[PDB]
Design a protein around this ligand. Sequence first.
Ligand SMILES: Nc1ncnc2c1ncn2[C@H]1O[C@H](CO)[C@@H](O)[C@H]1O
Ligand SMILES: Nc1ncnc2c1ncn2[C@H]1O[C@H](CO)[C@@H](O)[C@H]1O
Lengths: 577, 577
Amino acid sequence: PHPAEIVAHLQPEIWNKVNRLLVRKAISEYAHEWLLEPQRLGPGETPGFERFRLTLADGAQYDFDAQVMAMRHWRIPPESIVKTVAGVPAPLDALQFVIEIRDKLGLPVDRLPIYMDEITSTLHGSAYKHGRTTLGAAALARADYQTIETSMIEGHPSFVANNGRLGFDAEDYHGYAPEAATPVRLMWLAVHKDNAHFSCLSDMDYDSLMSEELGESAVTDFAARLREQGLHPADYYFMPAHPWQWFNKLSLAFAPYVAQRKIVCLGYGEEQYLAQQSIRTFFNISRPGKRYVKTSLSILNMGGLSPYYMAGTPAINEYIHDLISADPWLRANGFRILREVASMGFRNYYYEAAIDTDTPYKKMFSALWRENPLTLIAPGQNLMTMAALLHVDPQGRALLPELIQASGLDAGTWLERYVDAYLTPLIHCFYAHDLVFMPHGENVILVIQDGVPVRAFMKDIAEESSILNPQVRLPQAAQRLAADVPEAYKLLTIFVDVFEGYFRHLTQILVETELMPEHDFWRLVAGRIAAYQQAHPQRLDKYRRYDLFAPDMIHSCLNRLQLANAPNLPNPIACFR
Amino acid sequence: PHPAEIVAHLQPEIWNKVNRLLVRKAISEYAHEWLLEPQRLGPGETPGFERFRLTLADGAQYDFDAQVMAMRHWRIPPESIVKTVAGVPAPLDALQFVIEIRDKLGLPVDRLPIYMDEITSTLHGSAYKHGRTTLGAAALARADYQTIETSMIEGHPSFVANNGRLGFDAEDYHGYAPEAATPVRLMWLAVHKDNAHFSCLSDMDYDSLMSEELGESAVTDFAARLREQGLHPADYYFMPAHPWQWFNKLSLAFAPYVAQRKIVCLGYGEEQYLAQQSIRTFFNISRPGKRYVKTSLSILNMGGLSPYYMAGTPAINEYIHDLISADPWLRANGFRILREVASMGFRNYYYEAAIDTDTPYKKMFSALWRENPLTLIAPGQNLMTMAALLHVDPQGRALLPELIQASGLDAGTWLERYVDAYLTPLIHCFYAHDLVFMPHGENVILVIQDGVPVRAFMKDIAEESSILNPQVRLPQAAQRLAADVPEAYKLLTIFVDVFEGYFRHLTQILVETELMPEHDFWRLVAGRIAAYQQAHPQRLDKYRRYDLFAPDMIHSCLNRLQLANAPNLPNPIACFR
Ligand SMILES: Nc1ncnc2c1ncn2[C@H]1O[C@H](CO)[C@@H](O)[C@H]1O
Ligand SMILES: Nc1ncnc2c1ncn2[C@H]1O[C@H](CO)[C@@H](O)[C@H]1O
């Protein structure tokens, strides 16, 4: 393999294209979070926009068109952005922009080059994604679950430096990046019960999980392998790992355990998987209806996987699932979690003895198995990550209109179906159960039926969910699920993760594609919320206490939070109270 | 390739062996630096030693034999060390020891796991080196230059965490670790003159260097390659890089430059190299008398390579070489530097604009060529790293006695030859020229003639050398060479880098192998120094001002300095004044 081929995707014209796209996002999102305060100049190059200026690193100047939409959202046509340096035209360069605003960023000058490296890696991935052979909007909107999953481009829509994958070298990138869509086999390891522990749903056990996941031959073959090298299979579980994790972290940092045979490399599994958008979660493409496998993966990307939550994970999941199943409204709506049914943690007592506090060092060797949603839908239904609604192909065409065209519904009707499948159950979960998730594009999977959103699956459960009520009666293993939260913070999941985190980006698509005016979308959302409250009038106490129609709401600045690693925003639905 | 094979060297018995060796070193070196204060218990298991105790992490206890030699040196027989935890026998475990002394180490609890990872990697390498097929002491003492180079085991003899190679994953390790002795081909890159700059000796040029290093075919083929992809060779130099650096750092962090064709990957060179003990320096094994190539390599090991010194490197080297050549005493002794004859730096203007201060980020893409010493010795001479004198094979046999046996000389005579080849020229360089180096085991190469040390080569010149006289008249390019140093610090090179850094470990070998008593070695050294001063009586002013026979000397604590990343010691030669 010629050593140049790993960066063949890095060419001048494509680099320039993705840089312009990222400068737009950086300007939009930093402005949104008050890191940038653009100065209005006059009317825009495009009619209906106004022109703004940023005057930066003593020389650098960026003029652009913007329309400032709800929640202080800067809608910026990428082609409108004009950089000059002391009166001279200069190409848009996203790394250079971040440098020009380094003082405004507030980065200790030793985390700065790290953040620069994340921007660069984000660009490098973006170049690859825009250059690769891929389906356009029309075709993608009609494509299967996994084709859609691996064809996503944007990543998290608010984080500028959202796609770092720092730790993957150039070859790792092509084997393991979700966007390379290269089948991956998991690494199987025998893990000593001195170090390893397993948890699962009450109706299952380790042996039945393995029977299902590996089969009798593979499991027999593993025990034999161990016994054949003089070891006692009775002392071990079998545990999957990301191959990168094995070569980069476990064979090395965990050398004492390998040396002492507390970890034994058994080799690659037979079945092939595709990396999901989360990178560390894998979908089995070899065989039907098998669970996802989520592994620990020590790369930097905005922020591994811990065994101390791997003790209580299935129990948290069993509780939430039984709760949702026993609720007649949720039953009727069809909203459902995908259970993390079994988890396993290898505990590194060296790191645990050295560090008493929370650390990524305790989270380097864990696995869980997650329910496969294909098994839970009907013929004539398909699945897609909710991130797909925000998708724009390399030609600049949005997926959403193509999906709505295929459904045969007007945008209003389609959007109502979507809101009641996605937003309404979250609101019910909060009002009825104080139960909250992390409801972003990557954690939500929509069940689609001939173009129409019918219902939603929620994933990423044990690590993201809370019951906002310390009095809730929880099984002993699930206790962490309960949380005691300031009043102002209870509705954050809607205000922060739904409205500002996801809907803010959706309406920009709605407006660019002329599917619906912004005011019409917020009115639609307010109406779905109001219709819910009317159908469940007995929780008026809670509707008034936690007012979704309050004039303003807490603004969490995601990038500023990543950079550290604001005043209230007006509520877009306030005027519909 | 089975994924388990990369850690086949990690087995229980070998792991235990290398752990015991590292615990010994950690105890010895930390005690030496006052991090540990062992408490005398009584007489040793071995007669002539005393027994000491360390009482640690509330439970852990280590008893051991020691003999405290000059410069507060703790000579500790590895097999004498006995660990108990609350009265119960426990295996020696070096990672565990470091944890047990974490409070004494004074590490912010976020650098701690990093230091732990360095210890672990040091152990992992040590396991490999002790397990590999290798020459014993007798054979090694008679072996060729490169066999000796790749067969070194210890590394830096004072640093506990001396062999980290953090950044190499498990496969990288087998391709690129000096001890794996796997031939390496360099990666060739076309580097744009917008970014790249070249310096060399006044009697040479870029084109003659390349003619010699690559040849006309390879250089022609490179220009053609560039021209063939639509580029202009007139705009570029050709630059070598470590293949790991390309896959891990340059193709990724330098993506904008790759994308903009400021860096073009040309592929692997035809000629094969072996990694030297420095890891980033390569010796050409394909063809006779070619230069070493030193490349930038962004791994963690105790502390890359910078282009801002790559501008002045050959000029510093040309100055020092002409100085040594013009000096009749140095001429007569035969001491010589190996010139860094040409250097090249690629400048990353993104990092340079973001960070005004010294950083590893500015040092990621550089190369230099160094003079090959094989070209500078006679038939019947051989070369060996001075680190070889400290070498102990996996059977516990020392190389030094075997070398002395082969020479036919008594230890006293051999040692005198050695001191006058190594130490005396350093002393002259200081007294006559205020010229100092970094004279450790890895920077010094001895010319050996049928077992006898005849003279020494010094390498690592531009980055390590200083003229301790701000008044020295230096060519404009070499100005950094001059230094203005506190009085107490002028003789550091002898007191710190020679006596405490290297001789302290040598006498432990001399004593373990019964080659010479410690007092006899110091008397020998004092005599060589005194004989030098008598032969050059006109610098008595300087002998008195910088007294090598002062009662005590500054003690630099290397590990404490690495950990952060003491009172004076008695001078071992004071009593010979
Ligand atoms: N559309 C998306 N929305 C939210 N997070 C995303 C999205 N795509 C990828 N991610 C994230 O998934 C992981 C967060 O757990 C990270 O890898 C981060 O990239
Ligand atoms: N014997 C030695 N003496 C001093 N430094 C050594 C020795 N062996 C290896 N090194 C060091 O060489 C480099 C220091 O520039 C590091 O890779 C470090 O390991």
